[PDB]
Amino acid sequence: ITVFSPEGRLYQVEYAREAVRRGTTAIGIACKDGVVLAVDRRITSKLVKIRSIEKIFQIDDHVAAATSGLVADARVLIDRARLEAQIYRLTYGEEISIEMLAKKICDIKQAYTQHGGVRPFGVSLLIAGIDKNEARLFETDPSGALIEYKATAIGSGRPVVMELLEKEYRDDITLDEGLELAITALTKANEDIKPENVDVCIITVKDAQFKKIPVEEIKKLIEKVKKKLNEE
Amino acid sequence: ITVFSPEGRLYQVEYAREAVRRGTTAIGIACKDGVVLAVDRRITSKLVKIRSIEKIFQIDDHVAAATSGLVADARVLIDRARLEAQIYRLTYGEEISIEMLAKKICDIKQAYTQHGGVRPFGVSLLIAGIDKNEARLFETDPSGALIEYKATAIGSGRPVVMELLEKEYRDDITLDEGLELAITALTKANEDIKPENVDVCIITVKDAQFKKIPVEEIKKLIEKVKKKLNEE
Amino acid sequence: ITVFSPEGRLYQVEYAREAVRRGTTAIGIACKDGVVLAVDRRITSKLVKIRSIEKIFQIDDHVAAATSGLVADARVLIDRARLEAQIYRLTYGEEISIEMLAKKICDIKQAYTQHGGVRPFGVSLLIAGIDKNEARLFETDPSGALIEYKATAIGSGRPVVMELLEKEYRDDITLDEGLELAITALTKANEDIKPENVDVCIITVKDAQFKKIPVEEIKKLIEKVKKKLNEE
Amino acid sequence: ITVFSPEGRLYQVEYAREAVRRGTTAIGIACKDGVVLAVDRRITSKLVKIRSIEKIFQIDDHVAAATSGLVADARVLIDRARLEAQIYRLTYGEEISIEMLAKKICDIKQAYTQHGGVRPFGVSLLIAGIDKNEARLFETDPSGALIEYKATAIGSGRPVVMELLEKEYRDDITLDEGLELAITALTKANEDIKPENVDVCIITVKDAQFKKIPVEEIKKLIEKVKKKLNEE
Amino acid sequence: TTTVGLICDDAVILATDKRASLGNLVADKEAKKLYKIDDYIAMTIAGSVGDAQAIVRLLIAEAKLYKMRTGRNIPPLACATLLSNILHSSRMFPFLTQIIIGGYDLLEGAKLFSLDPLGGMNEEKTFTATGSGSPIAYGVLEAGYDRDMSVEEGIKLALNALKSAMERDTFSGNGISLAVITKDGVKIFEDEEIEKILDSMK
Amino acid sequence: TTTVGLICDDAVILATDKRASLGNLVADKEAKKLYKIDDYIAMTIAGSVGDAQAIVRLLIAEAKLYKMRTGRNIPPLACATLLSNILHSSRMFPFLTQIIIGGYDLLEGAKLFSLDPLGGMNEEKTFTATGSGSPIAYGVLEAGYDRDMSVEEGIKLALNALKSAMERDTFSGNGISLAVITKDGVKIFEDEEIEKILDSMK
C-alpha cells in the first residue's frame, strides 16, 4: 500500500524528495575547529515572531541537526532522534556516536519507505557534532543517507550553493573561516535575506559544546556581500 | 491508504487546508501586556443561542486557543488538547509550557497526515497564553506548525486582514491598543457583523489569567468603525 | 478508507446529510418552563402498530432526545447514549450534564467521520432536558454539532418550519405557548397529518421530569389549524 | 497487498530487480586462498568524505558482504544480517555457517515478497567468508538466491564483467592472481574510476580473518589497465 | 499523620500536622498534608505518603479539566465520588490511604467527605478526623462541638484537636497547617499567622 | 550508605559516604552515592544500589532531554515531581530506594527535596539527611544549624555530620564525597581537596 517503480527508481520516495528541494534552504559545514550550521528561513510577512520558525534542533549536549522540507515531519523526527539519543546514553553511558545517531533515524526514515500505508518523511536533515574530537556532518534523505560531507546544503537553493561550495571549499577551513562561507553562500540563493531570517548554531570541538549566535552578528557579516554582486 | 503528491506537494493535506480557508474567520494578537483572541461567528438565523457556537476554548488556567475549520474536528482536538495539558501538569507539576503544548497536538495532527486510513483534521488553530511572563501566539496547520506570530488570522477572511495586519501592527502595541486591532480588522472582512456574533477572550500576562468580554463592549468598540469606510 | 473533498467540503459527510433531509421531520422547542419535542411520523399504510415507530427516546429521568435520519443508526446511537449517560452518573453521581451528553455522542459521530473504513451516521438529533433549572435544546449533525437552539427542526420539511419558527418564536414563549408552535408548524410541512402520526413528550423544568401526551390531545390541537389555510 | 503476474513472472520483484542493475556495480571472487570483494563507488562530487559511502560490510569475524541497489535497504539488511549472525553464535557457539547465514536474510528477503503491504528489497548481496577452511561467495536476489559463485558481480556493469569473468576465471586462480581480476574487470565498466572510488576487502582463508587494502594499492593496480585499451 | 475537618456555619475548616514519621526516625520537620485541588475544594492526606502523594496530582488534573470541559468547578460531592471510584479501582490492587475533602458547592453549600483506602466514602455532616493520632483529636471535637459554632469557635476547636493529638501521639505533632474553604475561596494559612491564635487562646 | 542535604544562604550542599556494604562484608572502599544529573541539579542515592543506580541513568536521560526539547534546564521542583511519579509507578510493583535532589532553580532559587521509595516527596526548607546512618548525621544538624550559617559554615557542618555517623554506623563510614550546587554550576570536589577542610577544623 506504498509504492515501487516500473524500472529501477521508486515512486513516492522521489516525489517526497521534491518536497525538500522546494523547502527552505540550509547549509552545514565541517572543518577542523568544530562545526556550524545555518538556515535561510523565508519569513515574509513580519507578523511572526522569528523565534518560532524552528529550522535547527539540538539533539544532545554535543550533537545537533538542521531541517529542510515540511515542518510537519520536521519536529516529529527530532523529538524522536532526541529520543533515540538519550536511550543510547542510558544503556551504555556513552554520549551517543553521531554516525550511529544518524544511522538510526535515517533507518527509521527507511522503514517508512517500504511498509504498507505510510508516506515517507518530507525532509532531509543536517546532523553535526563532536564524535570524540572529530567534528562531523551528515545529510539524510527521506529514505536512507550514508553521506558524510565536509560541507553541503539542502532545500531551496540546493544547487545554487551545493555547487558554490563545489569549488572553493577546503579541508582546513577554520570556523571563523567558514564563518562567512555559509553566510555568503546563503545569500547567493537568497538575493534579499533579512538579518534574522537566519539561524546560526556553533558546536566547537574545543569543548564538545553547542552555542548560539545573536542577531546583527548575522547582519554585520551579511555585509561582506555587497562586494559580491559585481561582474560575477 | 491516505495520499502523497506527484511532485513536491501533498494530496489530502492541502485539500483539507481549504476546508479551513472556508471556515469562520479568526484573529489572534500578541503584545507585551498579555494576549487577546477573537472570532467572527457568522450565526445567520437568529434562532440559535449564540452560547453554543463555541469558537474559542480555554485549555488551562493560563492558556487557551481559538478554532477555525469544521467544528467536528474542533472539539475533538481540544477535548484532547485540554488533555495532553493536564497530563503534563501531573507528570511534572509545571503549568504546561505553551511552545510544548502546541508542539503536541500539532504533532498528532501531523501524525494524521502520514498514516493508514485516516483523514487529516480540517482545522487551523490559534493558541495563546502565558509561558512564564512571556505571552505568545501560535498558528497550527492540518499537518505541523511552528508559526509563532506576534499576530495573525485564519479562516474566511484570511487575506483581508492576514494582510491588513501586514503593516500597522507594532512590536509595541498594548492590549487596549490591540483592543481595536482585532475588532476593527475583523470588520474589514465582515461588512456587517452582529455585536455578539463575536467572542473575545483576554489573557493578561499581568496575572497569568484568562478573562471574558461581555456583549456591547464588543459593540461599543465595533463603533470605531464607521470612520473606516471613507476613501480607504 | 473514508473520504475528503477536493476543495474544502467533505464527501460522505454531506451525502449522509441528505439522508436526514429526506428522513421524517421533527421539531424541538425551548422556552422557560421546560422543553418539548414532537415528530411527524409519516405512517402511510395503517397495518403498522404506531407504537413501534420510534422517533423520540428517553435518555435519563431528566433528559431525552428525538431522532431523524435512518432508523438503523437511530437506535444504535441511543442504546449507547443511554450508556454514556449512566456511565457518567456512576463515575460522579451527577445527573449527567446536557451540554456534556450532547458533546459526547456528538464526539463519537465525529470520529466515525475521519476514520478508515466506516460510514458516519445517517442521523441528526434533537436532545433536551433540565440542566439544573436550565431547560435547553441541542441539534446534532453526522459530524459534530455545537448548536444549542431556543427551538429548531430537522428532516422532511426542515426549511418549512425551521423558517416558520424563524419569525414568531420568542425568548419568552411558555410551554402551553409552544403547545401549538410545534403542532401548527408540523402541520405546515405535512398537509394532512394523522392525529397520532405524531408523538409528544414534555419535560417541565418544574420537577426535572419527563411526561407523555395521549392521542386526541394531539388532534384537538391539530384543530386550531383550519384557520391557517386562509390567504397565508 | 503486493503483487503477482498474469503468466508466470512476478510484478514488483522484477521492477525491484532493475533498481539493482541500476545501482553501483560490484564484484566478488572465490578461489582457494580465501576470497575478495571490491566495489565501484561512483562518487562524482568530491565534496563527500569517501569514508561514509558504505558499500562493503562485515558480518562477523570471519564473514562479510558487499551491497548493490539502494542504500536505504543496504544497512537495514546488514544490521539485520549482523544480528541473525550473532544470534546463531549465541544459541550454539558456532561461528555461524556461511551457507546458513545467507540462507537466512535471503529467506527474509523472500518473505517480504509474498506478504501484503511491503516492497521487496532493492538489493543484491555479495556475501563472502571462511566456512571452516572452505572460503565461499554467494549472490542474493530480491527474492531468494541459491547461487554459490566462483566469482560474480552485481549492479551497473553487471553484463560488462559478469560476462568478462565468463571466460578467463579458473578454479585455480590465487588471491594475488584474483588481485587484478576484479580491478581490471571493474575498470571495463568504469572507464575512468578514481583510485579510491573503490574499496577492497580480503578474507584470507589462512586465518579466517578479514583485512583492508589501502589506497594506491588500489591505484598502483589500476595501472595494469592502460595496456588493456588496445585493439581489444 | 493527623488531620481534621469540620463544618461550622458558613464554610469548612481543615488542619494537619507537618510531621513525617519514618518508623522510629522523625523524617520531615514540615510535611504538607493539606492540599487545595480546585478554587472551591481542598483535601487532607493521611497515611501512605507517595501513595496519597500521587492521588493528589492524579486528581488535581482531573479537576482543572472538568472545570474547563464544563464551566462549573467540579462540584465537590462529585469530585469526591471520583475518589470512591479512583480508589476502589485498586481494590483488586494494593492501593491505600486516608483522606478528607471539603469544598463549597457552587450552590448546595459547604460539604465534607471522609474517605478510606478501599473506596468507602461518607458525607460527614458534623466533624471528622483522620491520622495516626486521630482518635485523640476525636475526643476533643466530640466533646467540643456544637451545631452552630462561629467562623471562629471552629478554627479554635480545630487547632485544639491537634494540640491534643500532636502531644499524645508518637507519630503526629511537628508544626501545624490549616486552611478554610468558603464560598468565595480557599485560604492557605502561612505558618506565621496561624500561631497568633493559640497565643490568643490558652 | 549515609547522605546529607542542607540549604545555607546562597545554594545547597550535598555529601555522602563512599561505603558499599555487602552484609557483613565491606564491598566497596569507594562507591559513588552523589551524581550530577543536570548543570543545575544533582542528587544522592541511599540504599538498594542496582536499583538507585538505574534510577539515576533512567532519569538524567529524562533531564538532558527536557533541557533540549524546551531550553530551560528541567526546573528542579519539576524533575523532582518525576521521581515522585517514577517511583510510584512501581508501587503496585517492587520498587525501592532513598534520594535527595539538590539544584538551583533558574529563578526560584535553591531547592532541596527528599524522597522515599514509594514516591513520597517533600521540599526540605532547612536540612535533611538519609542513609543507613542517617539519624546519626541528623542529630548533628538539628543542633548545629541556623537559618543563615554560610557557604563555609555549611560544608563544615556538612562533613561533621558524616564524621559522627561514619564512625558510629556499622554500615557507613568509608571515605567521603561532596559537591555543591549553586546558581552558576555544580562542583564535584576531587577527594584530595575535600580533606583540606577537617584539617583546618578540629
- Comparing CA positions, the residue from D151, D155, D225 lying closest to residue D191 is D225
Task: Give C 60-119 residues with CB within 8 A of chain E.
Answer: 90-94, 97, 99-100
Q: State yes or no: chains A and D have 3 or more CB pairs below 8 A.
A: yes
CA dist E115 and A117 (Å) reads 50
Distance from the first to the final alpha carbon of chain C: 50
Q: Is the Cβ–Cβ distance between B14 and B122 less than 8 Å?
A: no
Q: Which residues of D119-141 are buried (b: 16+ CB within 10 A; e: fewer)?
A: bbbbbbbbbbbbbeeebbbbbbb
CA dist C73 and E167 (Å) reads 67
Long-range contacts of residues D78-87, Cβ cutoff 8 Å, at least 24 apart: D79/A103, D79/A107, D80/D105, D80/D108, D81/D105, D82/D57, D85/D59, D85/D60, D86/D60
Give the three-class secondary structure for A210: strand
CA dist B211 and B38 (Å) reads 12
Alpha carbon of A171: minimum distance to chain B alpha carbons (Å):
34
Angle (CA) F20 F26 F30, round 5°: 45
Can you read off the three cell numbers belonging to residue F128? 535533611
Residue with cell 562479510: D64
Looking at beta carbons, which residues of chain F come within 8 Å of A83? Answer: 65
Alpha carbon of B13: minimum distance to chain A alpha carbons (Å):
11
Residue with cell 535575506: A193
Can you read off the three cell numbers belonging to residue A114? 517500504
Give the alpha-carbon dihedral of B81, B82, B87, B93, to 10 degrees.
120
- Comparing CA positions, the residue from B133, B49, B121 lying closest to residue B78 is B121
CA dist C4 and C21 (Å) reads 21
Looking at beta carbons, which residues of chain B come within 8 Å of E62? Answer: 86
Looking at beta carbons, which residues of chain A come within 8 Å of B4? Answer: 12, 15-16, 119-120
CA dist E169 and C85 (Å) reads 47
Can you read off the three cell numbers belonging to residue B158? 484570511
- Helix extents (H) in A96-141: 98-111
Q: Is D8 exposed, middle or buried (0-12, 13-18, 19+ CB in 10 A)?
A: exposed
- Comparing CA positions, the residue from D44, B165, B146 lying closest to residue A39 is B146
Q: Is the Cβ–Cβ distance between C71 and C54 less than 8 Å?
A: yes
CA dist D168 and D180 (Å) reads 12
Chain centroid, CA B53 distance in Å? 15
CA dist F70 and A25 (Å) reads 24
For F31, half-sphere exposure in the C-beta direction (CA atoms, 13 angstrom radius) is 23
Residues whose CB falls within 8 Å of the CB of residue D8, separated by 6 or more in sequence, listed in order: none
Q: State this model's resolution in angstroms.
A: 4.1
CA dist B7 and B17 (Å) reads 18
- Comparing CA positions, the residue from E19, E55, E5 lying closest to residue F122 is E19
- Phi then psi for F89, rounded to 5 degrees? -65, -40
Give the alpha-carbon dihedral of B200, B206, B208, B212, to 10 degrees.
-20
CA dist A41 and A68 (Å) reads 10
Q: Is the Cβ–Cβ distance between C65 and C56 less than 8 Å?
A: yes
3-state secondary structure E33-74: CEEEEECCEEEECCCCHHHHHHHHHHHHHHHHHHHHHCCCCC
- Comparing CA positions, the residue from A204, A184, A176, A197 lying closest to residue A55 is A197
CA distances from D40 to D25, D190, D212, F14 (A): 6, 8, 16, 60
User: What is the β-pairing status of strands D63-66 and D56-58?
Assistant: antiparallel
DSSP code, position D226: G
Q: Is the Cβ–Cβ distance between B201 and B211 less than 8 Å?
A: yes
CA distances from E73 to B62, C85, C160, E70 (A): 16, 20, 41, 8
Residue with cell 453521581: C93
Chain E nearest-CA residue for C93 = E78
Q: Which residues of C16-28 are buried (b: 16+ CB within 10 A; e: fewer)?
A: bbebbbebbbbbb
Chain centroid, CA A8 distance in Å? 28
Q: Is the Cβ–Cβ distance between A143 and A13 less than 8 Å?
A: yes
Which H helix or E strand runs over D112? none
Verify whether the Cβ–Cβ distance C145 to B71 is below 8 Å.
Answer: yes
β-bridge partners, C84? none
Chain E nearest-CA residue for B90 = E57
Alpha carbon of B66: minimum distance to chain E alpha carbons (Å):
15
Angle between helices E151-166 and E134-142 (to 10 degrees): 140
CA dist E68 and E62 (Å) reads 10
Q: Is the Cβ–Cβ distance between E106 and C94 less than 8 Å?
A: no
- Comparing CA positions, the residue from C131, C70, C122, C75 lying closest to residue C103 is C131
CA dist E134 and E118 (Å) reads 19
Q: How many CB pairs under 8 A join A and D?
A: 91
Q: Is E93 on the interface with F (CB under 8 A)?
A: yes
- Comparing CA positions, the residue from A101, A99, A97, A121 lying closest to residue A111 is A121
Looking at beta carbons, which residues of chain F come within 8 Å of B93? Answer: 77-78, 81
CA dist D12 and A116 (Å) reads 14
Q: Which residues of E28-37 are buried (b: 16+ CB within 10 A; e: fewer)?
A: bbbbbbbbbb
CA dist B50 and C150 (Å) reads 10
β-bridge partners, C64? C58, C128
For F74, half-sphere exposure in the C-beta direction (CA atoms, 13 angstrom radius) is 28
CA distances from A205 to A34, A127, C159 (A): 4, 15, 74
Q: How many other CB atoms sit within 10 Å of the CB of residue F84?
A: 23
Give the alpha-carbon dihedral of C169, C170, C175, C176, to 10 degrees.
-70
CA distances from F124 to A92, E97, F111 (A): 33, 23, 8
CA dist A144 and A111 (Å) reads 9
- Comparing CA positions, the residue from A185, A191, A223, A217 lying closest to residue A202 is A217
Q: Choose the closest CB to E20 out of F122, F126, F134.
A: F122
Residue with cell 435518555: C59
Give the three-class secondary structure for F102: strand
- Comparing CA positions, the residue from A117, A107, A135 lying closest to residue A205 is A135
Angle (CA) A212 A217 A221, round 5°: 125
Verify whether the Cβ–Cβ distance C10 to B71 is below 8 Å.
Answer: no
Can you read off the three cell numbers belonging to residue A66? 538542521
Residues whose CB falls within 8 Å of the CB of residue B116, separated by 6 or more in sequence, listed in order: A1, A116, A117, A118, B1, B2, C116
CA dist A5 and D69 (Å) reads 13
β-bridge partners, D204? D34, D209
User: What is the β-pairing status of strands A134-139 and A151-154?
Assistant: unpaired
Looking at beta carbons, which residues of chain E come within 8 Å of F138? Answer: 25
DSSP-derived secondary structure for C51-62:
TT---EEEEETT
Long-range contacts of residues E65-70, Cβ cutoff 8 Å, at least 24 apart: E65/B82, E65/B83, E65/B86, E67/E38, E68/B58, E68/B59, E68/B60, E68/B82, E69/B79, E69/B82, E69/C100, E70/C97, E70/C99, E70/C100
Verify whether the Cβ–Cβ distance D19 to A3 is below 8 Å.
Answer: no
Q: Which residues of D191-200 are buried (b: 16+ CB within 10 A; e: fewer)?
A: eebbeebbbb
Chain B nearest-CA residue for A11 = B6
Chain centroid, CA B22 distance in Å? 15
Q: Is the Cβ–Cβ distance between A43 and A25 less than 8 Å?
A: no
Residue with cell 569514508: D51
Using only the alpha carbons of chain D, give its radius of gyration: 18
CA dist B78 and B65 (Å) reads 9
CA distances from B61 to A58, B130, B133, B149 (A): 30, 10, 14, 22
Give the three-class secondary structure for A6: coil
Residues whose CB falls within 8 Å of the CB of residue B159, separated by 6 or more in sequence, listed in order: none
CA dist D142 and C42 (Å) reads 65
Q: Is the Cβ–Cβ distance between F162 and F177 less than 8 Å?
A: no
Can you read off the three cell numbers belonging to residue A32? 577542523
Write down which chains contact chain A via at least 3 CB pairs under 8 A.
B, D, F
CA dist B170 and B153 (Å) reads 16
Looking at beta carbons, which residues of chain F come within 8 Å of A203? Answer: none
Q: Is D153 exposed, middle or buried (0-12, 13-18, 19+ CB in 10 A)?
A: buried
The B135-139 sheet, strands edge to edge: B56-60, B63-69, B123-130, B135-139
Q: How many other CB atoms sit within 10 Å of the CB of residue E149?
A: 16
Which H helix or E strand runs over E4? strand E3-8
CA dist D72 and D102 (Å) reads 20
Angle (CA) D6 D8 D11, round 5°: 60
Q: Is the Cβ–Cβ distance between B142 and B20 less than 8 Å?
A: yes
Q: What are the catalytic residues of C? A: 24
β-bridge partners, B101? none
Residues whose CB falls within 8 Å of the CB of residue C17, separated by 6 or more in sequence, listed in order: C124, C141, C142
Which H helix or E strand runs over E28? strand E25-28
CA dist C182 and C201 (Å) reads 12
Binding-site residues on chain C for chain B (CB distance < 8 A): 1-10, 99, 103, 106-107, 110-111, 113-117, 136, 138, 141, 143-152, 165-166, 169
CA dist B212 and B202 (Å) reads 6
3-state secondary structure chain B: CCCCCCCCCCHHHHHHHHHHHHCCEEEEECCCCEEEEEEECCCCCCCECCCCCCCEEEEECCEEEEEEECHHHHHHHHCCHHHHHHHHCCCCCCCCCHHHHHHHHHHHHHHCCCCCCECCCCEEEEEEEECCCCEEEEECCCCCCCECECEEEECCCHHHHCCCHHHHCCCCCCCHHHHHHHHHHHHHHCCCCCCCCEEEEEEECCCCEEEECCCCHHHHHCCCCCCCCCCC
Give the three-class secondary structure for A38: strand
Q: Which residues of E151-166 are buried (b: 16+ CB within 10 A; e: fewer)?
A: eeebbbbbbbbbbbbb
Residues whose CB falls within 8 Å of the CB of residue C212, separated by 6 or more in sequence, listed in order: C200, C201, C202
Q: Choose the closest CB to B91 out of F69, F77, F85.
A: F85
Write down how long chain F is.
202
CA dist E25 and F173 (Å) reads 20
- Comparing CA positions, the residue from C37, F113, E63, D167 lying closest to residue B90 is E63
Q: Is E51 exposed, middle or buried (0-12, 13-18, 19+ CB in 10 A)?
A: buried
Verify whether the Cβ–Cβ distance F119 to E51 is below 8 Å.
Answer: yes
The C123-131 sheet, strands edge to edge: C56-60, C63-69, C123-131, C134-139
Write down which chains contact chain C via at least 3 CB pairs under 8 A.
B, E
DSSP code, position D118: B
